[model samples]
Target: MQIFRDVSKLLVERVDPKILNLFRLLGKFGDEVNMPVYVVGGFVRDLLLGIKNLDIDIVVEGNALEFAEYAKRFLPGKLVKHDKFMTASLFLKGGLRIDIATARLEPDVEMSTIKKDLYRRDFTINAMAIKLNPKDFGLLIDFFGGYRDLKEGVIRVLHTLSFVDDPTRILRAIRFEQRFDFRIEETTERLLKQAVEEGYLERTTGPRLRQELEKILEEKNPLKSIRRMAQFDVIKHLFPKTYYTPSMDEKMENLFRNIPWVEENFGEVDRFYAVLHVFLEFYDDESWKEVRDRYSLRRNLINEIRHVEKSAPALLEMLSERVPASFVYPLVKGVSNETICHFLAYLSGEKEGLFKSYLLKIKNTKLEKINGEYLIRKGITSGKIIGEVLEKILMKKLDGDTRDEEEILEEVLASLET
Candidate 1:
């Protein structure tokens, strides 16, 4: 029972003008088709808070696919329809994704209702919608007091069985709690704890669990939810094979500093892998294998993790001494930048010089004066010999032992004679 509140001004002020016009035009099209449309879920929540969210969700009281098609008359985009579920997605040119779905009804109810649609969502703050019908465009529709919860900075579950029905909500609860700096409502927190203790995570499917965990790890400041996950005892049930020790917190906290540096220097390294490697580094082959299988991680990613596990300590040992670039190159050659960030974060002190040195200089070292054509002209035709000889020349370049082409050629000839 919500009193009418027109947030048309808020919509106008907060949303991009192009998007507002699109919504208005969409409402006009809905009017033409005699279907009521509402902008729902995270888009509305973020809109009220004046956060920039380009991902819009639309709920139509009538057939969503038909409404989407009708809207295409005014608003054109790539329409992806899911007719069986009566849902569709319109991907606009400027990276806007508008998800459209029919206003769902409760199983026992005959009439489709917005209240029922919002009721089925996970938390109160995400359970709000805005009217997109021409008559009441931008009208705030609060069926569950979501506006109050949003203003109060609280994460409250719609129902107690929320975690029971979908245990991944447990991860999402902590994620949102940390994301918005909100506290979980007291009752909701209790219910969450109860659900965790009752082993609701066991019922969760692997891919969904992995997806939620990935979302948590991919957040702007993931460590907050991660620590919260540990506190809530969610980690053990979610990752039965992995362990989060008290000692790991310091390294995990220290990892934040390296994340940006890695991104800046190395471009896009997997944040999930970068952070998870801190824990995975400690896991034995058998234990990490279980985590890999459960999380449905790809083979290459697991291999990368394995490479870090093998290389980090060996890198540490080599860095402890005055090792030449040639010796270090083989060990660190194929290691990912994400793994390098993990090394940078946890393995600090004297070893940082060599790590930074490798990234800045040695990692990209090339032979200044050697070419494959020159090697072949000198009667070195075997691919293995050519590969080995090229690497040997590069090593000399890395070690600064050769400069001129003749100096490099002499080394190649010497290696051939040996």
Candidate 2:
């Protein structure tokens, strides 16, 4: 708990002043209504963990919807409510979203009713809350041993029956473990193994499973998470037919190592393809079809994989030659730089200088003069013939066959005659 003292102070100091003011307004409103309220879940957890730029979640012991409506009168943004769950959300400026929920009680009406609410949470670290009243500011609340577990760097389930109730939590457990470098409690690990053995995870919906998998891939160190999942046999259970050979693991690591380089040079692209490139290298058509059918990925994702599959070999062949800017640009124009760089790295043995030159040309090349419009003004018409002739002239200029606009225009007119 001493850890929280330092964290609490930092949070109060770092929190957006507007957010703090909003909290004060909500607290004052709660006082007027004689209702209890506290900021809960990720907001408190991230604060204690000293995480900046965190989202806030507020839980009220009374009607959350009513509290949201009351606050909406003065709040600067929209109020969205879910009637079935009796919850609401307030979206503020600067892309901040706060969730509000009424305190939940166990159906039994006894035996520490708050335990049910905390137990239903994803992990122990996220199962705690903090007081929001003026007098009780910064007071920590632990319905479970969340504070203790967080200090110990332990990831534990709220209940043994949790994985059985919602099997997707298995994936969530691994993600949290990898994300925070936390250890799974021995009992929890054993229960996860038992759950997998009993096949309870098979009951999870494909969309839910896909959602968790996508989130895992979105992490910065996603390869580690996927490797851990495969190590624990979670991958086989969820994607039994998907390939998981040792060579595939090595390739996946190599690809992941190149992601930062790609991001540094090229902007964001399809990350899923980056993952697929390494993981699916050994996948045959039948296996690819199985995995595709299970995830129901978007058309673009499927198309990307197909394009890589067909073009990878030809791109490798191009890397062996003295690749010109004109040559490499056409090959990588529509694909991601990460994918292009990965291919270049793999074929570097034969094409290192050429690859470097290709990238440098892309970085430094500037159009000195001449475009299709210029040609159109020079008596060229809108047709395939004009495009073909212009492309030939650009290629000649790129290849150093011509150096000036007059020279290129002379070549273009000569080509039309040919």
Candidate 3:
């Protein structure tokens, strides 16, 4: 119990004011129960590193659900409970998530108590805690020298079989490595690789890997985790049906550059799906089908990937021409941001610039000034001809062929008459 002082003060600088208040209220509730409640795991680790994250963890001496019930009043977040393990989660306002657990050992594998929970964790860097109560509000619980590893910037597993017991730790190990600029300890790296070679990955369920993959992609950038996965043979272990190559790496590199550009200009998009677009670029039909079914991927994602796969050549053709942004918008309007980012890799020179312009501005600037209603009122009879004429006039006016409603309206009427 190598406790440290001024941890709360450290929090004062990095944590949100509302969250700091919530931690203080948690301390009060811990005193009410006379339990050794504390904010444990990654929250403690990250705080020590001066990282401010919205996710927090609290472990109670007993009946965490009971403690979580009391926490609701302070957090204003609904208490979602899992009775099996006596854990509860609160999704507070502003996308904050806090997990409260009664801290117990897993049934199959011998584990540690709430007090000794650090010993049972997957890694030393994560096996630390800090007192959340007033009397010992900032006492560090370094049961496993978590601070040493954090200082050293290395990831070390609690036990040799850590990966054996939980193979998803393989992905997690890589995730932390890339996120924190840390290296896996040599022995831990061996265990992770051994687990992959020994088919522990094959034993893991698809959704489990899928879930891990989601967090991995959401890291600072998807390339580091993915390239690390390829290094570990884990990616191959998970997807044996497809060939893994550095070409996919190239695609992700371009994607990394493209994702921020899209968000900065086109407005924010579902960047997680944007990474998935590059991830599946090389999967064969059978391999693609398995991933789709395995992850229970959202229908939107599956449809968009398929749409982009089919639509890319034609979309490229349209961009390759001298058409203005108006001509480009309608053809690519329904394209998903994910697909757009992925397909963006194929073009260069003027084609790339035109598509980028369309994504940034032209697509968002609508032709609301001249609607189908406006055309109909101008004696442009409503039917297939009206549809065709409207689209043509809308494109021309958008490209600055006419300035005002009268100019556009006459153009529409004359097109119908001719």
Candidate 4:
């Protein structure tokens, strides 16, 4: 109903002039090639909302692959092409990346107009565009009242079959909803629930499902999105578990607080593993087997889960007492950083101290004066016995039972006598 024209002022305020110059160059190229190019999707929407985003998506009303290839002469970046859909990504220096796509109604079907391209997007909030063609440069295109939805803080899909066509949109809908603190509009909510009730999500591939779930987990505070997923029964359909409970909510809150601490102390945590660990904390072997097959979970993730399942309980039990580093070493040895996140997430206040001690004191600590050769020099002959003696000395060293080479040698000599 309302016309939005020439928003160059807004574009100038949010985007760097250098980037704008780059876009202008791209638009000039589009003009030469006779293809209308526009900045679409999140870049345009976020520009209006005053959110910072650098992931620019340029939709070309022609062969995007050819356009990107030709633009490489001016842009001077690695042009990576997606042969399947005529889309390409130009990775510029200093890590600025731009994605170029043919204006398509779907991945397989190329459309000629930006209106058709915007119509097929997931939600109204993300369905706007900014013209880049030199003639109508910086013209805001909103054929679907996306600006209205943005102002009302609502998430509305473009069409009724939006979720049915791509059930991943259901997850994306909730993600945008939670990310912007917006609510799903009435008809959109009805369609989303109907799609879930009809098992449309199950029709989606495992990798796609995993991808959406990971995006949710990657949010700065994923608890609200997760709760929304449960409210829509999406969680139940994806993994066979109940993730939205009072106790689970408390653990997620703790997890949100503990993630930064782990990253500061232990390095960056694999957000997916850290959050997935919370959901699977109460899962038994059978439950894991089912979800593992359903999600086609990666082998490393499977291994981490297995490692956490086997050790977290034992370590929690042993750490109840004031245990020595010798006891903690065997329990936590070879634990992955991701699994460490799992461990840190569940540890009680007192028990957390012991785990921290294990990490700092014993996890990767080496014996300064003890080795197999040292044990052999102290008169242990058999290879097996030498290995055993070296391990014993190291354990003693870890427990602070020995302080230096002399003490380690004494333990080795005593062991040889035995």
What would the per-residue lDDT of candidate 4 be over residues 215-304, giving only the tens digit for each residue? 887865587888788788887677667566777667666676667777887687777767777677667767777777877765466666
Instruction: Give the lowest summed-lDDT range of ten residues in model 4.
Output: 104-113
- Candidate with best lDDT: 4
Candidate 3: deviation at residue 47, Å? 2.7
List per-candidate RMSD values in Å: 3.4, 4.6, 5.2, 3.8
For model 1, the stretches where C-alpha displacement exceeds 4 angstroms are: 1-4, 92-95, 106-112, 282-286, 300-304, 321-324, 371-373, 376-383, 404-418
Clashing residue pairs in candidate 2 are none
Better of 1 and 4 by lDDT: 4
- For 212-275, candidate 1 gives per-residue lDDT tens digits of 8879977756888888988888877876655677757766776766777778877887877776
lDDT of 3: 0.74
Q: Order of candidates by TM-score, top first?
A: 1, 4, 2, 3
Clashing pairs for predicted structure model 1, backbone only: none
lDDT score for candidate 1 against the true structure = 0.77
What Cα-based lDDT does every candidate model obtain?
0.77, 0.69, 0.74, 0.78
Return the clash pairs for model 4, or none: none
Q: Tell me the tens digit of each residue's lDDT in model 3 across 166-250.
A: 8989999999998998999999998999999999988988888888888887787568788888888787787675444766677
Model 3 / residue 43 / CA error / Å: 2.0
Instruction: Indicate the worst ten consecutive residues by lDDT in candidate 1.
Output: 104-113
**Residue 291 error, candidate 1, Å:** 3.1
User: Candidate 2 regions off by >4 Å?
Assistant: 1-28, 73-77, 93-95, 106-111, 133-139, 194-202, 237-241, 281-290, 293-296, 300-303, 310-330, 341-356, 360-398, 404-418
Candidate 1 vs candidate 3, TM-score winner: 1
Best by TM-score: 1
